[PDB]
Amino acid sequence: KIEEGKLVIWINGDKGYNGLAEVGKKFEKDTGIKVTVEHPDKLEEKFPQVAATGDGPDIIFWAHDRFGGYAQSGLLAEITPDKAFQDKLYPFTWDAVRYNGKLIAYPIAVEALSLIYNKDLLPNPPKTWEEIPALDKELKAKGKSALMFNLQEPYFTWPLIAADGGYAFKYENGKYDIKDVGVDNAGAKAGLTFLVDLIKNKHMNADTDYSIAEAAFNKGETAMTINGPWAWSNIDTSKVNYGVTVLPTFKGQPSKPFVGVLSAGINAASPNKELAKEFLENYLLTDEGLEAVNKDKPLGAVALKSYEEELAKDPRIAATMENAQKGEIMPNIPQMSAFWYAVRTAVINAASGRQTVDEALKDAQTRITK
């Protein structure tokens, strides 16, 4: 029971929803159908709930990791573009949105986390995680901190856990093995232990969330933060003189971020599939439609080769790609939501001291593997 003749879009509150709304605004100025863009809370958990009932949005935007679960549950329409359109996008990006060899979403942008630093407070960013505790001791003396980032969402902590060997699911033939999980190996335990230690040594606080880390850096009280492209618009308005670069190394290895592909899916239950398709392929996925969204909140490296060509010149995009290169594309299997929930509890229990690192990762491994 969705109302034909309109488009309702769901996008996360951290993305350029006002720019998206302008893209729909000239969709309608030229097609008569109104597009309404919403950013509900926890949309990613709500979608499967109402979509199930034959409700929800026409189009849902999220990183590709949640899409194999939606596809398995029968909530998404298979998209079928065409080889000329497919050719306009980087091939690895359509691979991120293939579920059982079928395409189930349009790729939009490639996101990777980077190290953001205040050049006025730290002209040369550190190359290693290991020098962060000494750096904090000097800034603290001057009333500032070396680094603050969201500790509440496992997405932010995974690059460090993965650096020395942690992994989610082993990719074995061209299949992910759901029984071979790397959350409790020596690599994962070494990274999580370094994090807990920064905490126990008062270099970071266990409660820092997205808001606190973002205000701390935007106000100049912390020299560095770890975030994605979407955060740049707020740093620009704060006028901090910042740099975006490669994440620090841990035990000599590159921090390895999970790479996300912002994707747009069509609810299986919509009577507007062709309008949806119109909208995504001919309006949004254009240099003009992507530019409009990007002005609002930067998208990262886009999937459309044409526009990415324009963006690649920006050192912030170059740093984005370099960290994506060092990282791994997330799986899109249904089990990714179980993985994230288990790791989220493990990290909060370890950081808060409610469990040791070993008991926290062992419980997570257990939980993910049944």
Ligand X SMILES: OC[C@H]1O[C@H](O[C@H]2[C@H](O)[C@@H](O)[C@@H](O[C@H]3[C@H](O)[C@@H](O)[C@@H](O)O[C@@H]3CO)O[C@@H]2CO)[C@H](O)[C@@H](O)[C@@H]1O
> Where along the sequence are the contacts to ligand X (CB under 6 A)?
12, 14, 44-45, 63, 65-66, 111, 153-155, 228, 260, 337, 340-341, 344
Q: Look at residue 45 and give its three-state secondary structure.
A: helix
Contact between 224 and 127 under an 8 Å Cβ cutoff? The reply is no
Nearer to ligand X, 31 or 72 (CB): 72
Nearer to ligand X, 27 or 339 (CB): 339
Q: How are beta strands 7-10 and 59-63 bridged, if at all?
A: parallel
- What's the closest the beta carbon of residue 6 comes to ligand X, in angstroms? 26
- What's the closest the beta carbon of residue 102 comes to ligand X, in angstroms? 21
For tokens 């942008």, what's the residue?
109
Angle formed by the axes of helices 336-352 and 154-163, nearest 10°: 80
- What's the closest the beta carbon of residue 266 comes to ligand X, in angstroms? 19
**How many Å apart are CA 365 and CA 361, to the nearest integer?**
6
- What's the closest the beta carbon of residue 10 comes to ligand X, in angstroms? 13
Alpha-helix runs per DSSP H in 201-286: 210-218, 232-237, 273-278
Q: How are beta strands 145-147 and 222-227 bridged, if at all?
A: parallel
Nearer to ligand X, 10 or 155 (CB): 155
Nearer to ligand X, 63 or 364 (CB): 63
- What's the closest the beta carbon of residue 257 comes to ligand X, in angstroms? 10
Q: Any idea of the CA torsion for 159, 328, 117, 291, to the nearest 10 degrees? A: -140
Nearer to ligand X, 76 or 135 (CB): 76
